[PDB]
Design an enzyme around this catalytic site. Structure first.
Site, PDB file in Angstrom:
ATOM      1  N   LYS A  13       0.617  -1.197  -0.053  1.00 21.35           N
ATOM      2  CA  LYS A  13      -0.013  -0.115   0.203  1.00 21.35           C
ATOM      3  C   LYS A  13       0.369   0.949   0.070  1.00 21.35           C
ATOM      4  O   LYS A  13       0.748   2.012  -0.389  1.00 21.35           O
ATOM      5  CB  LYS A  13      -1.342   0.418   1.460  1.00 21.35           C
ATOM      6  CG  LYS A  13      -1.420  -0.930   1.260  1.00 21.35           C
ATOM      7  CD  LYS A  13      -2.645  -0.879   2.677  1.00 21.35           C
ATOM      8  CE  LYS A  13      -2.352  -0.995   3.813  1.00 21.35           C
ATOM      9  NZ  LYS A  13      -0.907  -2.034   4.261  1.00 21.35           N
ATOM     10  N   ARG A  88      -9.294   1.802   9.688  1.00 22.35           N
ATOM     11  CA  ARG A  88      -8.192   0.509   9.975  1.00 22.35           C
ATOM     12  C   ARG A  88      -9.350  -0.337  10.718  1.00 22.35           C
ATOM     13  O   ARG A  88      -9.587  -0.788  10.721  1.00 22.35           O
ATOM     14  CB  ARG A  88      -7.563   1.244  10.630  1.00 22.35           C
ATOM     15  CG  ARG A  88      -5.678   0.659   9.947  1.00 22.35           C
ATOM     16  CD  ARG A  88      -5.597   0.156   8.891  1.00 22.35           C
ATOM     17  NE  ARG A  88      -4.310  -1.062   9.690  1.00 22.35           N
ATOM     18  CZ  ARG A  88      -3.191  -0.126   9.757  1.00 22.35           C
ATOM     19  NH1 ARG A  88      -3.161   1.245   9.429  1.00 22.35           N
ATOM     20  NH2 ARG A  88      -2.048  -0.835   9.774  1.00 22.35           N
ATOM     21  N   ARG A 123      11.655  -4.456   5.009  1.00 21.83           N
ATOM     22  CA  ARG A 123      11.258  -3.127   4.857  1.00 21.83           C
ATOM     23  C   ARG A 123      12.163  -2.106   5.390  1.00 21.83           C
ATOM     24  O   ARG A 123      12.844  -2.511   6.917  1.00 21.83           O
ATOM     25  CB  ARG A 123       9.692  -3.280   5.010  1.00 21.83           C
ATOM     26  CG  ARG A 123       9.445  -1.159   5.454  1.00 21.83           C
ATOM     27  CD  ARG A 123       8.052  -1.260   5.302  1.00 21.83           C
ATOM     28  NE  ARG A 123       7.637  -2.210   6.186  1.00 21.83           N
ATOM     29  CZ  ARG A 123       5.970  -2.117   6.155  1.00 21.83           C
ATOM     30  NH1 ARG A 123       5.525  -2.107   5.510  1.00 21.83           N
ATOM     31  NH2 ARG A 123       5.471  -2.875   8.166  1.00 21.83           N
ATOM     32  N   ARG A 156      10.996  -0.101  10.298  1.00 28.61           N
ATOM     33  CA  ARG A 156      10.154   0.347  11.691  1.00 28.61           C
ATOM     34  C   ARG A 156      10.426  -0.132  12.978  1.00 28.61           C
ATOM     35  O   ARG A 156      10.541  -1.192  12.653  1.00 28.61           O
ATOM     36  CB  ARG A 156       8.866   0.490  11.272  1.00 28.61           C
ATOM     37  CG  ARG A 156       8.478   1.387  10.002  1.00 28.61           C
ATOM     38  CD  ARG A 156       7.348   1.064   8.896  1.00 28.61           C
ATOM     39  NE  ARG A 156       5.777   0.433   9.744  1.00 28.61           N
ATOM     40  CZ  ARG A 156       4.928   0.223   9.782  1.00 28.61           C
ATOM     41  NH1 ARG A 156       5.245   0.198   8.468  1.00 28.61           N
ATOM     42  NH2 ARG A 156       4.349  -0.398   9.805  1.00 28.61           N
ATOM     43  N   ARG A 167      -0.165  -7.937  14.006  1.00 28.88           N
ATOM     44  CA  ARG A 167      -0.787  -7.370  13.859  1.00 28.88           C
ATOM     45  C   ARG A 167      -1.223  -7.236  12.362  1.00 28.88           C
ATOM     46  O   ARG A 167      -2.821  -7.053  12.352  1.00 28.88           O
ATOM     47  CB  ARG A 167       0.500  -6.219  12.383  1.00 28.88           C
ATOM     48  CG  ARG A 167       1.052  -4.858  13.770  1.00 28.88           C
ATOM     49  CD  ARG A 167       2.270  -4.294  13.276  1.00 28.88           C
ATOM     50  NE  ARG A 167       2.290  -3.756  11.745  1.00 28.88           N
ATOM     51  CZ  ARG A 167       3.432  -3.689  10.885  1.00 28.88           C
ATOM     52  NH1 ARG A 167       4.545  -3.844  11.545  1.00 28.88           N
ATOM     53  NH2 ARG A 167       2.837  -3.142   9.661  1.00 28.88           N
TER      54      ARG A 167
HETATM   55  N1  ADP Z   1       4.344  -5.828  -5.455  1.00 31.15           N
HETATM   56  C1  ADP Z   1       5.604  -5.765  -4.530  1.00 31.15           C
HETATM   57  N2  ADP Z   1       5.989  -6.897  -4.309  1.00 31.15           N
HETATM   58  C2  ADP Z   1       7.033  -7.236  -3.781  1.00 31.15           C
HETATM   59  N3  ADP Z   1       7.469  -6.994  -2.590  1.00 31.15           N
HETATM   60  C3  ADP Z   1       6.922  -5.337  -2.324  1.00 31.15           C
HETATM   61  C4  ADP Z   1       6.180  -4.832  -3.317  1.00 31.15           C
HETATM   62  N4  ADP Z   1       5.318  -4.214  -2.789  1.00 31.15           N
HETATM   63  C5  ADP Z   1       5.796  -3.245  -2.015  1.00 31.15           C
HETATM   64  N5  ADP Z   1       6.892  -4.093  -1.997  1.00 31.15           N
HETATM   65  C6  ADP Z   1       8.362  -4.477  -0.501  1.00 31.15           C
HETATM   66  O1  ADP Z   1       6.761  -5.472   0.818  1.00 31.15           O
HETATM   67  C7  ADP Z   1       7.359  -4.101   1.996  1.00 31.15           C
HETATM   68  C8  ADP Z   1       5.891  -3.896   2.537  1.00 31.15           C
HETATM   69  O2  ADP Z   1       5.657  -3.111   1.427  1.00 31.15           O
HETATM   70  P1  ADP Z   1       4.389  -1.431   2.086  1.00 31.15           P
HETATM   71  O3  ADP Z   1       4.284  -1.268   0.386  1.00 31.15           O
HETATM   72  O4  ADP Z   1       5.099  -1.052   2.657  1.00 31.15           O
HETATM   73  O5  ADP Z   1       3.476  -2.536   1.922  1.00 31.15           O
HETATM   74  P2  ADP Z   1       2.244  -1.735   3.448  1.00 31.15           P
HETATM   75  O6  ADP Z   1       2.406  -0.346   2.881  1.00 31.15           O
HETATM   76  O7  ADP Z   1       1.092  -2.246   2.971  1.00 31.15           O
HETATM   77  O8  ADP Z   1       1.826  -2.402   4.785  1.00 31.15           O
HETATM   78  C9  ADP Z   1       8.623  -3.060   1.440  1.00 31.15           C
HETATM   79  O9  ADP Z   1       9.609  -3.523   2.246  1.00 31.15           O
HETATM   80  C10 ADP Z   1       8.545  -2.554   0.010  1.00 31.15           C
HETATM   81  O10 ADP Z   1       9.116  -2.335  -0.398  1.00 31.15           O
HETATM   82  N1  AMP Z   2      -6.144   3.967  10.967  1.00 27.94           N
HETATM   83  C1  AMP Z   2      -5.184   3.729  12.378  1.00 27.94           C
HETATM   84  N2  AMP Z   2      -6.044   3.548  13.056  1.00 27.94           N
HETATM   85  C2  AMP Z   2      -5.911   2.767  14.076  1.00 27.94           C
HETATM   86  N3  AMP Z   2      -4.658   2.175  14.346  1.00 27.94           N
HETATM   87  C3  AMP Z   2      -3.291   2.804  13.288  1.00 27.94           C
HETATM   88  C4  AMP Z   2      -4.407   3.190  12.694  1.00 27.94           C
HETATM   89  N4  AMP Z   2      -2.713   3.297  11.127  1.00 27.94           N
HETATM   90  C5  AMP Z   2      -2.053   3.120  12.495  1.00 27.94           C
HETATM   91  N5  AMP Z   2      -1.931   3.023  13.228  1.00 27.94           N
HETATM   92  C6  AMP Z   2      -0.966   2.395  14.178  1.00 27.94           C
HETATM   93  O1  AMP Z   2       0.170   2.189  13.337  1.00 27.94           O
HETATM   94  C7  AMP Z   2       0.949   0.722  13.387  1.00 27.94           C
HETATM   95  C8  AMP Z   2       1.098   1.667  12.090  1.00 27.94           C
HETATM   96  O2  AMP Z   2       0.070   1.050  10.981  1.00 27.94           O
HETATM   97  P1  AMP Z   2       0.708   0.912   9.733  1.00 27.94           P
HETATM   98  O3  AMP Z   2       1.784   1.907   9.516  1.00 27.94           O
HETATM   99  O4  AMP Z   2      -0.316   1.586   8.548  1.00 27.94           O
HETATM  100  O5  AMP Z   2       0.970  -0.492   9.161  1.00 27.94           O
HETATM  101  C9  AMP Z   2      -0.412  -0.029  13.541  1.00 27.94           C
HETATM  102  O6  AMP Z   2       0.000  -1.017  13.431  1.00 27.94           O
HETATM  103  C10 AMP Z   2      -0.860   0.754  14.533  1.00 27.94           C
HETATM  104  O7  AMP Z   2      -0.800   0.768  15.891  1.00 27.94           O
END
Ligand code: ADP
Ligand code: AMP
Length: 214
Positions: A13, A88, A123, A156, A167
């Site tokens: 995402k 969420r 990541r 992170r 999560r």
């Molecule tokens: N289509 C894909 N294929 C493989 N790896 C990906 C893809 N999209 C994102 N990633 C990698 O996987 C990890 C999760 O992607 P991310 O975009 O951060 O996911 P989200 O924001 O949904 O939690 C990141 O390190 C990213 O660089």
């Molecule tokens: N919309 C939301 N509602 C509740 N918690 C959130 C939300 N967005 C982020 N968080 C918190 O932030 C963490 C990381 O979110 P994210 O970066 O979207 O993966 C989550 O595991 C939650 O602890």
């Protein structure tokens, strides 16, 4: 244009949010990015998230709804925006509806549970900008460095295996029901809904999204 990105942690995402921001010129509103930044700066609105994020749990609906409303009310969002990681929960979605915050597209990123931990292991992020990389699947141009600022990338604090597991449970309990919710919104003609295969390479997911949005 207003967009919601829906999907499990690690689905892709944040990665695709960047492309959409670049292509369509709309701001990325990432509640995760905002809360992490609030914790780092000690901002009164959001600093409370530190322990909750560390536990891999969702912060209160109240808190993130406030964060989103503040961000949305600002200038750069007047002509569209992308919500990345918000809503969420169903109450978060209902709060959007009650506040008259309709959306044009809901985009569901479909990735199997089994790909998640392994994927997130790799990541790395540039916290000042929100840019996201993967050491294997989407590497920075210089190993360990942000492409723009050249600053050393970080991991992170919530991206370790055990926290990712927690999560994912929270996602299925609280967040997955938004698939049904927004599908029903789309059946009522209130938004468009589309599901993309998040297992394809980054560039292919990008092209699939362009077809849907363009
Ligand atoms: N289509 C894909 N294929 C493989 N790896 C990906 C893809 N999209 C994102 N990633 C990698 O996987 C990890 C999760 O992607 P991310 O975009 O951060 O996911 P989200 O924001 O949904 O939690 C990141 O390190 C990213 O660089
Ligand atoms: N919309 C939301 N509602 C509740 N918690 C959130 C939300 N967005 C982020 N968080 C918190 O932030 C963490 C990381 O979110 P994210 O970066 O979207 O993966 C989550 O595991 C939650 O602890």
């Amino acid at each position: 244009m207003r967009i919601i990105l829906l999907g499990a942690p690690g689905a892709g995402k944040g990665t695709q949010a960047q492309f959409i921001m670049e292509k369509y010129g709309i701001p990325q509103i990432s509640t995760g990015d905002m809360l992490r930044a609030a914790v780092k700066s000690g901002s009164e609105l959001g600093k409370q998230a530190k322990d909750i994020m560390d536990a891999g749990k969702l912060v209160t609906d109240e808190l993130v709804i406030a964060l989103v409303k503040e961000r949305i009310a600002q200038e750069d969002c007047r002509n569209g925006f992308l919500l990345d990681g918000f809503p969420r929960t169903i109450p978060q979605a209902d709060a959007m509806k009650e506040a008259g915050i309709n959306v044009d597209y809901v985009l569901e990123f479909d990735v199997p549970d089994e790909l998640i931990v392994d994927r997130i292991v790799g990541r790395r992020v540039h916290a000042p900008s929100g840019r996201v990389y993967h050491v294997k699947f989407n590497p920075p141009k210089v190993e360990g460095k942000d492409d723009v600022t050249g600053e050393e990338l970080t991991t992170r604090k919530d991206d370790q295996e055990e926290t990712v597991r927690k999560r994912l449970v929270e996602y299925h309990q609280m967040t997955a029901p938004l698939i049904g919710y927004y599908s029903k919104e789309a059946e009522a003609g209130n938004t468009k809904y589309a599901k993309v295969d998040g297992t394809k390479p980054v560039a292919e997911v990008r092209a699939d999204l362009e077809k849907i949005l363009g």
